[PDB]
Amino acid sequence: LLLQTNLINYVTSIRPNIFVGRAEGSTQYGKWYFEVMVDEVVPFLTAQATHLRVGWALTEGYSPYPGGGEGWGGNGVGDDLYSYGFDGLHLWTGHVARPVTSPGQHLLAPEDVVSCCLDLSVPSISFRINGCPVQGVFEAFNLDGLFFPVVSFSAGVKVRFLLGGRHGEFKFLPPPGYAPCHEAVLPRERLRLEPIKEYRREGPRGPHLVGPSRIVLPPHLERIREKLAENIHELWALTRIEQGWTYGPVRDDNKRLHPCLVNFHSLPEPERNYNLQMSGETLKTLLALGCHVGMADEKAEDNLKKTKLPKTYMMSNGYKPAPLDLSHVRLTPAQTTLVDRLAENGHNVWARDRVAQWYRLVPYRLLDEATKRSNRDSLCQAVRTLLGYGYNIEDRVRIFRAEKSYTVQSGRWYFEFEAVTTGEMRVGWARPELRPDVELGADELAYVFNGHRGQRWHLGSEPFGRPWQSGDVVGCMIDLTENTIIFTLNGEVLMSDSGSETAFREIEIGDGFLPVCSLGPGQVGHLNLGQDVSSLRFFAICGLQEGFEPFAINMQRPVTTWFSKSLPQFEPVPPEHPHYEVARM
Amino acid sequence: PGQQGRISHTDLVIGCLVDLATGLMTFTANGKESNTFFQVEPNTKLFP
Amino acid sequence: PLINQYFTNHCLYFLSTPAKVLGSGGHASNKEKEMITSLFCKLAALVRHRVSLFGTDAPAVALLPVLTTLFQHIAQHQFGDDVILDDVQVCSIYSLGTTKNTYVEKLRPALGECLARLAAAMPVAFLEPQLNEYNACSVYTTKSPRERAILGLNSVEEMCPDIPVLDRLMADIGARYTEMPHVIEITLPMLCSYLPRWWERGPEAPPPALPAGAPPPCTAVTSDHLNSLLGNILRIIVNNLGIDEATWMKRLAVFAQPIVSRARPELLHSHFIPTIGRLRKRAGKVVAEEEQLRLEAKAEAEEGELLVRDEFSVLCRDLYALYPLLIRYVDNNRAHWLTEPNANAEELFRMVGEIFIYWSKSHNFKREEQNFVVQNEINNMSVATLKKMLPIGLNMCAPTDQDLIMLAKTRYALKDTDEEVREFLQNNLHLQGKVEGSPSLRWQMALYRGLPGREEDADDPEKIVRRVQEVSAVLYHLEQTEHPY
Amino acid sequence: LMPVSWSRMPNHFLQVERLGWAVQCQDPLTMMALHIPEENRC
């Protein structure tokens, strides 16, 4: 009936940037294994016994928050339904330790290797002791979300991972059918370790705050099919000539022999008739967008000219190329992306054939930056001939603020904010009773300024000042004596449309004021509260000699800086709800 | 739970095992959501 | 509805982003063809208002074949070509009244899409009559000599001089641009580059058409190759500044001096650090005010005992001097004041002379209440408006961040300052001095970087008080500024 | 249930990379926490 108190040490978990799942699409065979070994020197620390756990999370746990949790301490894994744990004696799931029997009944002693078994079709997760099995298994669980290898650990523990790519020395043999991150793992970046749901990270000069992380056919259409198929043969012949690899007298497939030394119709039909089949299908699909082709300009056939071929250009291949001049032909790069969707769809169809029948590619939208751009450029330089022919077409916002104790009622106060990125950020002041779960400045509870779009927010947006870029340290004047709020950017006072100087005149004192900052998704930037004058970037434009005082001028400790949670806790129904009224009969 | 979901909220059922698993007394334990589903219970063209 | 129709276009200014791709240009350009047809159509309905609304309608994958008014645009601007030749004699109706119709067209800095094949034919056709008639020659002065020069944008969409003057073979026979003229572009400004060093004449007659010759090339050079050529603008700052030295005389031309500064007040590298001559211009800038400071002495002497008509002495003196001087005050504070504090913040000796100066303007305004009368006269020549806000930006950081942030003696003398205390009485009676190292804000906020910030702090007790006494005197006038509002 | 409620940032954080991507930790840390019996949460 009464509240209890004790001491609990902090708990945190780490995970590499590896993801896996099962769904309709590029599954990457979804068969993988994880093997690590631990080596620690703290069997029993000062307060309690350190704990280590192993398991997986379906990218929906977000359990690690430094501080209190659903049980006693912010456990990494096994304290809910979105993670699993194995401490060497029990299995952890939702604060329930289920004991299991296995040889070597002891905790995770140093210099011990473990392995994890994963199944994608039927829910099945199992583990593996140094050389012994486990008498338990996880089964009948949902799979909505990507899975990453996660281990919970306390202070004092050192551990390393194994990858198999560059420095993964697998002491224990891999399971029969699971790969060590071979086919396609993070293809558009590298691999490393990173915490989950990290709302704060250390900075070089000062700590930074990071935001949340997420048939009938027109004859013109019919005749142009042959008029464009011939250009495809022309381009391939042109490409063959530009390669410089003449067909070799000896018939070897490994010397990059060219099987195109044959008539344009006497050739083996399956390789090119199907090749022409996509050409018509891609063209008919791309034009299937509501646009009807008609000769309403007569600027296509009259432009038919013969390109100039130097005598040295013609070579023994015997196929005359006709490439149109590109010295001054540059229509647009923007419309090239219109054909990207079909090519990605076509590659995806090609991907399905490659994977249905596995010793590979993935969806083209997220293959990799370098290759996809190169392939798109390679595809663009061939489809531009069609266009050169003369044819035309047609997850929330976290809020950061100080606590109610530091409310100010008078004086001239000032603090500095830095915007490392250039996303959606807002800085300003707010009333002590700032209700969360509402946009900054949407209601009358704050006077916030948005530097991303040059807008000021108070009961509605309004254009004010210029947008942001890299750097752009921004401060905030304030003066309750004369009831003014003034912003500064990199050493200059912002200007309004009417020429006013941060027009926020005649603001009531109210219950004092309070500094506040907000962060959009995927944004990095830290705020300085003026613990010492040195850390201030300038303090030499509007605060040095105008009577203004830095906020944390005479403190001996950092400000608490309360922030906003994510988990939906429980609250009683307020009696003054606008439209939810309960009555007890 | 929040929103964007109404089905498949409970997972990680019990994993009890025996020598031969011949005991005919088992249940989907570890059910975090001891819930029902009324919307599928009645069937009539009225509003009672 | 002609004025009514333009309301929608005036209201719809954001049409450029989501709309205005191919439908606006096809029909908007055809409307101006009506203007030339109705140019000679005299009627009772006022045409100045008809062209006023039309004067705002002018701004409003690679194939643009619907454009046909571009070709008809060439003949549109040739209407005034013959009138310029006839303008030498002045004919009764063919005069400057019909010239105003071409002013709107040339002011298109943003909408650059087409070339219209007019590379340099039009600018040269009108440049020669302006240059060849620099002398007054007893002819009527052009209504807007500066506007015509400003009309020349430095490009239309891609322009470089010296193309057709020397080359005449491929011009009419047969792309090739921005590669021929390399060491011939700056050839005519060099001839007049020595003019500021040679225009030592007092009156403005020897420069009879200065506003039509000096502004137009100055803006052109800083436009082209601004990011590649950096020494070109260095001569630009020196050239214009020397010409403006003639403005030092009180009354020379009331219609020429104000127009020059407003025509091109922008500066890029005119700061003291890149241009050390700007620091030397402080002595010249001092003479602008120090000579004008002594002017008020004559008014005060004649304002004693009211022996003669005071309005005959005080009003006759400040009227001629203060009327054009206001252009000089805004010239320094236009953009040069944006770079001085950076040098001042890093070093206290950057603008000591300027800091110890420019207070004479407030000193003159303290007495001589008639100054507001002439100030209003110049206000409409071009509330708590900018008339009295001139020194606020200059007295903001210059005197406060001077020395001895924590001295606690100005405030005590502040009440004494607003007590008609003579300078001698202020100096001698305040020779005691006071300071206290309390653990209040003066302990840490002050003397922790106020003294370390000053690299070489001066050691003189009364001299620092003199700066405080001068600073305090400026404060005693700030009450009057708040009293009006 | 509310969507989001306020929270207090801890004054300190745990201190913490190659050759298998090893991660180390040596600084001990502790914190005194409350608990509600009915709510069964820290």
Short mmCIF file of N, CA and C in Angstrom, two decimals, chain A residues 48-104:
data_model
loop_
_atom_site.label_atom_id
_atom_site.label_comp_id
_atom_site.label_asym_id
_atom_site.label_seq_id
_atom_site.Cartn_x
_atom_site.Cartn_y
_atom_site.Cartn_z
N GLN A 48 25.09 -4.63 -7.08
CA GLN A 48 24.39 -5.87 -7.37
C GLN A 48 25.27 -6.72 -8.29
N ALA A 49 24.68 -7.78 -8.84
CA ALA A 49 25.37 -8.63 -9.79
C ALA A 49 25.05 -8.19 -11.21
N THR A 50 26.08 -7.99 -12.01
CA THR A 50 25.88 -7.61 -13.40
C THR A 50 25.14 -8.72 -14.14
N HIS A 51 24.36 -8.32 -15.14
CA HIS A 51 23.54 -9.26 -15.90
C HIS A 51 23.82 -9.10 -17.38
N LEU A 52 23.81 -10.23 -18.10
CA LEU A 52 23.91 -10.24 -19.55
C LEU A 52 22.82 -11.12 -20.12
N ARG A 53 22.32 -10.73 -21.29
CA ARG A 53 21.22 -11.43 -21.93
C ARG A 53 21.42 -11.40 -23.43
N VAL A 54 20.81 -12.37 -24.12
CA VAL A 54 20.90 -12.49 -25.57
C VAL A 54 19.50 -12.71 -26.13
N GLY A 55 19.24 -12.12 -27.29
CA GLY A 55 17.94 -12.25 -27.91
C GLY A 55 17.82 -11.33 -29.12
N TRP A 56 16.58 -11.18 -29.58
CA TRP A 56 16.27 -10.38 -30.75
C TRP A 56 15.06 -9.51 -30.47
N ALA A 57 14.98 -8.38 -31.17
CA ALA A 57 13.88 -7.44 -31.05
C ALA A 57 13.35 -7.09 -32.43
N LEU A 58 12.03 -7.02 -32.56
CA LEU A 58 11.38 -6.76 -33.85
C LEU A 58 11.14 -5.27 -34.07
N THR A 59 12.20 -4.48 -33.88
CA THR A 59 12.25 -3.04 -34.18
C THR A 59 11.02 -2.29 -33.67
N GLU A 60 10.37 -2.83 -32.64
CA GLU A 60 9.22 -2.19 -32.02
C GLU A 60 9.29 -2.22 -30.50
N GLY A 61 10.44 -2.56 -29.93
CA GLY A 61 10.60 -2.56 -28.49
C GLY A 61 10.84 -1.17 -27.95
N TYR A 62 11.92 -0.52 -28.40
CA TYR A 62 12.34 0.79 -27.90
C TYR A 62 12.47 0.77 -26.38
N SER A 63 12.73 -0.41 -25.82
CA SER A 63 12.79 -0.57 -24.37
C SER A 63 13.85 0.29 -23.70
N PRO A 64 15.09 0.39 -24.21
CA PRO A 64 16.12 1.08 -23.41
C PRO A 64 15.89 2.57 -23.31
N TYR A 65 15.42 2.99 -22.14
CA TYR A 65 15.40 4.38 -21.72
C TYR A 65 16.16 4.46 -20.40
N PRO A 66 17.25 5.22 -20.32
CA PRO A 66 18.00 5.30 -19.07
C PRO A 66 17.13 5.77 -17.91
N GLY A 67 16.89 4.89 -16.95
CA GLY A 67 16.03 5.21 -15.83
C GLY A 67 15.04 4.11 -15.50
N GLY A 68 13.87 4.50 -15.00
CA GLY A 68 12.87 3.52 -14.63
C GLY A 68 12.21 2.87 -15.83
N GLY A 69 11.55 1.75 -15.57
CA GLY A 69 10.90 1.00 -16.62
C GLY A 69 9.62 0.33 -16.17
N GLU A 70 9.13 -0.62 -16.97
CA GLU A 70 7.88 -1.30 -16.63
C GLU A 70 8.02 -2.16 -15.38
N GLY A 71 9.21 -2.69 -15.12
CA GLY A 71 9.45 -3.45 -13.92
C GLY A 71 10.29 -2.70 -12.91
N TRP A 72 11.51 -3.18 -12.67
CA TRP A 72 12.47 -2.51 -11.79
C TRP A 72 13.75 -2.32 -12.60
N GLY A 73 13.91 -1.15 -13.18
CA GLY A 73 15.06 -0.87 -14.02
C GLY A 73 14.74 -1.04 -15.49
N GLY A 74 15.39 -0.23 -16.32
CA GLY A 74 15.15 -0.25 -17.75
C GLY A 74 15.85 -1.40 -18.44
N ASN A 75 15.33 -2.61 -18.27
CA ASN A 75 15.98 -3.80 -18.80
C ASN A 75 16.05 -3.75 -20.32
N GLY A 76 17.09 -4.37 -20.87
CA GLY A 76 17.31 -4.38 -22.30
C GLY A 76 16.38 -5.30 -23.06
N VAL A 77 16.41 -6.59 -22.72
CA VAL A 77 15.60 -7.59 -23.41
C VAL A 77 14.93 -8.48 -22.37
N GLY A 78 13.85 -9.14 -22.81
CA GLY A 78 13.15 -10.09 -21.98
C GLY A 78 12.20 -9.51 -20.96
N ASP A 79 12.07 -8.19 -20.90
CA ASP A 79 11.17 -7.54 -19.96
C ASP A 79 9.82 -7.20 -20.58
N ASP A 80 9.58 -7.61 -21.82
CA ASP A 80 8.32 -7.34 -22.51
C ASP A 80 8.14 -8.39 -23.60
N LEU A 81 7.17 -8.16 -24.48
CA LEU A 81 6.87 -9.08 -25.56
C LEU A 81 7.61 -8.76 -26.85
N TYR A 82 8.42 -7.70 -26.87
CA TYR A 82 9.15 -7.31 -28.06
C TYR A 82 10.63 -7.67 -27.98
N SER A 83 11.01 -8.55 -27.05
CA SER A 83 12.39 -8.96 -26.92
C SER A 83 12.43 -10.31 -26.22
N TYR A 84 13.58 -10.97 -26.32
CA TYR A 84 13.79 -12.28 -25.73
C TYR A 84 15.15 -12.30 -25.04
N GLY A 85 15.27 -13.12 -24.01
CA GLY A 85 16.48 -13.14 -23.20
C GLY A 85 16.88 -14.55 -22.82
N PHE A 86 18.18 -14.72 -22.62
CA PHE A 86 18.74 -15.98 -22.13
C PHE A 86 20.00 -15.66 -21.34
N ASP A 87 19.95 -15.88 -20.03
CA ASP A 87 21.04 -15.53 -19.13
C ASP A 87 21.94 -16.70 -18.81
N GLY A 88 21.73 -17.85 -19.45
CA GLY A 88 22.45 -19.06 -19.13
C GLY A 88 21.73 -19.99 -18.19
N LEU A 89 20.69 -19.51 -17.51
CA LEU A 89 19.89 -20.32 -16.60
C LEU A 89 18.41 -20.28 -16.92
N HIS A 90 17.90 -19.14 -17.39
CA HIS A 90 16.49 -18.97 -17.67
C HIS A 90 16.30 -18.31 -19.04
N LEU A 91 15.04 -18.24 -19.46
CA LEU A 91 14.64 -17.48 -20.63
C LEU A 91 13.79 -16.30 -20.20
N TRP A 92 14.12 -15.12 -20.72
CA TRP A 92 13.49 -13.87 -20.29
C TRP A 92 12.47 -13.43 -21.32
N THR A 93 11.23 -13.23 -20.88
CA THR A 93 10.17 -12.73 -21.75
C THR A 93 9.10 -12.10 -20.87
N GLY A 94 8.98 -10.78 -20.91
CA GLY A 94 7.97 -10.09 -20.14
C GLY A 94 8.16 -10.20 -18.64
N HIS A 95 9.39 -9.99 -18.17
CA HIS A 95 9.73 -10.05 -16.74
C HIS A 95 9.42 -11.42 -16.14
N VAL A 96 9.52 -12.47 -16.94
CA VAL A 96 9.31 -13.84 -16.48
C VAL A 96 10.54 -14.64 -16.90
N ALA A 97 11.27 -15.15 -15.92
CA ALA A 97 12.45 -15.97 -16.18
C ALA A 97 12.02 -17.43 -16.11
N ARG A 98 12.09 -18.12 -17.25
CA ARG A 98 11.70 -19.52 -17.32
C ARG A 98 12.94 -20.39 -17.32
N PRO A 99 13.19 -21.17 -16.27
CA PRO A 99 14.44 -21.95 -16.21
C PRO A 99 14.47 -23.06 -17.25
N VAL A 100 15.67 -23.34 -17.74
CA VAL A 100 15.91 -24.41 -18.69
C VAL A 100 17.11 -25.21 -18.23
N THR A 101 17.18 -26.46 -18.68
CA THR A 101 18.26 -27.36 -18.31
C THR A 101 19.20 -27.57 -19.49
N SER A 102 20.50 -27.56 -19.20
CA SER A 102 21.53 -27.72 -20.20
C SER A 102 22.86 -28.01 -19.51
N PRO A 103 23.79 -28.71 -20.17
CA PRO A 103 25.10 -28.94 -19.56
C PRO A 103 25.81 -27.63 -19.28
N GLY A 104 26.54 -27.59 -18.17
CA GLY A 104 27.21 -26.37 -17.76
C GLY A 104 26.24 -25.33 -17.23
#
